[PDB]
Design a protein around this nucleic acid. Structure first.
Lengths: 185, 370, 53
RNA sequence: AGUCUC
RNA sequence: AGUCUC
RNA sequence: AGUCUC
C-alpha cells in the first residue's frame, strides 16, 4: 500500500485577469473541471490559467473509469499590497457535478479572509458501471465534479492554486486516448 | 384453441450462445496500400462501427441483446511472402477525447496486438470492452466512445506487387468477460503495464549500434514540447521509487530476410559504446527463426540492487543518470541480401513482485522514446 | 529457372499386391471413386474477391 | 495477469 | 393423423 | 477407397 505524508499534486493555477475592469462589473468567474482536467473562464479579461502535468493531473485525464475518494485543497494567494484594513473582497466556491445551470450544488462555501486562505475538502467518485463513473459520458448520462468560483473584486483575491491528493481506495479502469499534453517553458 | 401469448418465450434475456459461425457479428476489410509507411493509420474509428459491418448470423443479436457476457473476439487475416515484412497493430481503448494521439505508445496499453504478416498469417485476439465489469453491449460501446485503431507500426520492408487488404472477422466469444481494474495506491501482482519502450533499428553492417532504454519509465513518453500518456503508465508515475521482475516482449517488425543477433543486458548510462566486456554482465542473446516474430525476455529483480526513481529530470545526462538502463546491441552483424534495417519493437509487458516506495510530486516533461 | 530442368522417375515392382477396382454401373460402391477435375482457379494479385463458381 | 498457441 | 389447447 | 505420409 504505497503512501507518503504531505504529498499532494498540483492540478491548476488560475490567475485573475490583470486587465479586469471594475467599472464594467465587480466580479468575475472561472470553473475547474476536477475530473476532466479543464479550466473555464470569463470574457471579463485576459485570464492566466494553467493545468500542471503532475502525476495526478495526468492520471485523471487519461483514466476512463474512476471510483473512490480524492482530496481537494484550494489556496488563494492575494494582493499583498492592499492594507488589511482596506480588504473588500470575497470569493464564493461551489461544487456541482455539472456546469449546467439546472444542476443544484453539492456544496457551497464563501471565503473572505484577507490576503490569503485555504480550503480543504474531499470529493468522491460514484458511478453506474460498477460504482465506476466515466467523465461526462452520455452513457448513463454520467457526470463529473466541477469547482466553480465567483471572485468579487479580482484585484485583491488574485490567485488560486488547486492541489489534489489521491486516497488509498481510488481505483480506475480503462484508458482514454488523449492528445499530447503540452509541456510549458 | 386460443394461444396464450404470455406463456410464449419472447422475453429471453440470455447472452448469445453457439458455434463461431453462429456467433459471427461483423467483418471489416482494412486496406493496406503497397506504399504504406509506418506511423500510418490504416483505420481509426469507434469500435461500434467495426462491429456493425455486414449482416452475419449474430448481427441482430448484437443489436438486440441488452447484456452480452462473452468477450469480443477478432480473427485478422493476411499473408505476405518471407522476403518482405510489415508490422501492424490493432489497438483497443475505452474512450477517446479530441484529436488523440495514434502513436504506438499511446494506443497499446489496454488491449493491443502487434503482428508481422510475414510470420503470423492469421492472428486472434479476445478482449473485454468493459474493464470494470463482466458484460458489455452495443449501446454501451456507442455512447461510451470505445475506440479501435489499426495502424502500421513499421512500413513494408519490400513493397508488394499490388495493394493488400487485411480482413477481420468479429465474433462474440464463448469465454466470459472478466474485469481488470487498477487500485492506484495498491498495485496487484503482476502489475500490467504494457508500456512501449521504443522501436529499435539496427542498420546492415558490422556496427554495434548500442541502444539505451532508460528504466525510469514514469511521466509518459516524450514528444515535441509535450508528453504522451496512457493509463497504466500514469499509475506507475504516482509512485516515487520502484523495482520488480521486468518482462519484455520483443517483436521482429521487419522481413524474415534481415538477420541479426541482438544482445540484451542491464547496465548504467555511463558506459561507452565500445566497452569491450559488456557481455561480462548477465545477458541474453536473441535470434529469430524465419517465421518467428515474438520473443519474451524476463529480467529478474536480482539484476537490480535497489529500487530506482520512477521519474528523472528529462535533461539528465547519461553520465549523471543513476537509474538502470536496458541495453540492446548487435552481437555479430546485421546482414541481408535485400535492403533494409533490422527493426525490433520492445514492450514492457508486466512487472512481477513489484515493490514501490513513496508518492511522487512529479517532474515536468519526459524523454523521447525510440 | 536459370537453366533447363529434368525430372527423374525410378520404376519398381512393388511388394504390395495388386487389387482390383471395378465399377458396377447401376450399383455404385461406397465410396464412389470419381476423380473429376473441377477446374484450375486463378486469383490475380490484388484486393479483388474473384468469386469462382 | 490477460490474450495466444498447443 | 397432424395442428392446437391444457 | 486407393495412393501417400508417418
Amino acid at each position: 500500500s504505497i503512501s507518503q505524508q504531505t504529498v499532494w499534486n498540483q492540478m491548476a493555477t488560475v490567475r485573475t485577469p490583470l486587465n479586469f475592469d471594475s467599472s464594467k462589473q465587480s466580479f468575475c468567474q472561472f470553473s475547474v473541471d476536477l475530473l476532466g482536467g479543464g479550466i473555464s473562464v470569463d470574457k471579463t479579461g485576459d485570464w492566466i490559467t494553467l493545468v500542471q502535468n503532475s502525476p495526478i493531473s495526468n492520471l485523471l485525464r487519461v483514466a476512463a473509469w474512476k471510483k473512490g475518494c480524492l482530496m481537494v485543497k484550494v489556496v488563494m494567494s492575494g494582493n499583498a499590497a492592499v492594507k488589511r484594513s482596506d480588504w473588500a473582497s470575497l470569493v464564493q466556491v461551489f461544487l456541482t457535478n455539472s456546469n449546467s445551470t439546472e444542476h443544484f450544488d453539492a456544496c457551497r462555501w464563501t471565503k473572505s479572509e484577507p490576503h490569503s486562505w485555504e480550503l480543504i475538502f474531499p470529493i468522491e467518485v460514484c458511478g453506474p458501471n460498477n460504482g465506476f463513473e466515466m467523465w461526462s459520458s452520455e452513457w448513463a448520462n454520467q457526470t463529473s465534479w466541477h469547482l466553480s468560483f465567483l471572485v468579487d473584486n479580482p484585484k485583491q483575491s488574485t490567485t488560486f492554486d488547486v492541489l489534489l491528493g489521491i486516497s488509498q481506495n481510488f481505483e480506475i479502469a480503462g484508458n482514454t486516448l488523449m492528445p499530447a499534453f503540452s509541456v510549458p517553458q | 384453441m386460443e394461444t396464450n401469448l404470455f406463456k410464449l418465450s419472447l422475453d429471453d434475456v440470455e447472452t448469445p450462445k453457439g458455434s463461431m459461425l453462429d456467433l459471427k457479428i461483423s467483418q471489416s476489410k482494412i486496406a493496406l496500400p503497397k506504399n504504406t509507411v509506418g506511423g500510418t493509420i490504416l483505420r481509426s474509428d469507434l469500435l461500434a462501427n467495426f462491429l456493425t459491418e455486414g449482416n452475419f448470423r449474430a448481427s441482430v443479436d448484437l443489436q438486440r441483446t441488452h447484456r452480452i457476457k462473452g468477450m469480443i473476439k477478432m480473427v485478422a487475416t493476411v499473408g505476405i511472402p518471407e522476403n518482405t515484412g510489415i508490422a501492424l497493430a490493432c489497438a483497443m481503448n475505452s474512450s477517446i477525447r479530441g484529436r488523440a494521439s495514434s502513436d504506438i505508445y499511446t494506443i497499446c496499453s489496454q488491449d493491443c496486438e502487434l503482428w508481422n504478416p510475414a510470420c503470423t498469417k492469421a492472428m486472434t485476439m479476445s478482449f473485454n470492452p468493459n474493464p470494470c465489469s463482466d458484460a458489455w453491449s452495443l449501446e454501451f460501446l456507442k455512447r461510451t466512445g470505445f475506440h479501435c485503431d489499426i495502424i502500421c507500426v513499421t512500413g513494408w520492408t519490400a513493397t508488394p506487387m499490388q495493394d493488400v487488404q487485411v480482413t477481420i472477422d468479429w465474433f462474440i466469444s464463448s469465454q466470459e468477460c472478466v474485469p481488470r481494474t487498477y487500485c492506484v495506491l495498491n498495485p496487484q501482482n503482476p502489475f500490467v503495464l504494457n508500456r512501449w519502450m521504443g522501436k529499435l533499428t539496427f542498420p546492415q553492417g558490422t556496427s554495434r549500434s548500442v541502444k539505451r532504454m532508460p528504466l525510469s519509465i514514469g511521466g509518459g513518453a516524450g514528444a515535441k514540447s509535450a508528453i504522451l500518456m496512457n493509463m497504466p503508465n500514469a499509475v506507475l508515475s504516482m509512485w516515487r521509487y520502484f523495482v520488480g521482475d521486468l518482462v519484455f516482449e520483443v517483436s521482429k517488425m521487419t522481413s524474415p530476410y534481415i538477420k541479426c543477433t541482438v544482445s540484451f543486458f542491464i547496465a548504467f548510462g555511463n558506459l561507452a559504446d565500445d566497452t569491450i566486456n559488456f557481455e561480462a554482465f548477465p545477458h541474453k542473446l536473441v535470434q529469430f527463426g524465419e517465421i518467428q516474430e515474438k520473443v519474451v525476455l524476463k529480467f529478474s529483480q536480482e539484476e537490480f540492487l535497489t529500487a530506482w526513481s520512477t521519474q528523472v529530470r528529462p535533461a539528465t545526462t547519461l553520465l549523471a543518470d543513476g537509474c538502470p538502463y536496458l541495453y540492446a546491441m548487435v552481437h555479430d552483424s546485421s546482414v541481408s541480401t535485400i535492403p533494409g534495417d533490422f527493426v525490433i519493437g520492445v514492450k514492457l509487458t508486466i512487472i512481477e513482485n513489484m515493490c514501490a516506495y513513496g508518492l511522487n510530486p512529479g517532474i515536468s516533461g519526459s524523454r523521447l522514446l525510440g
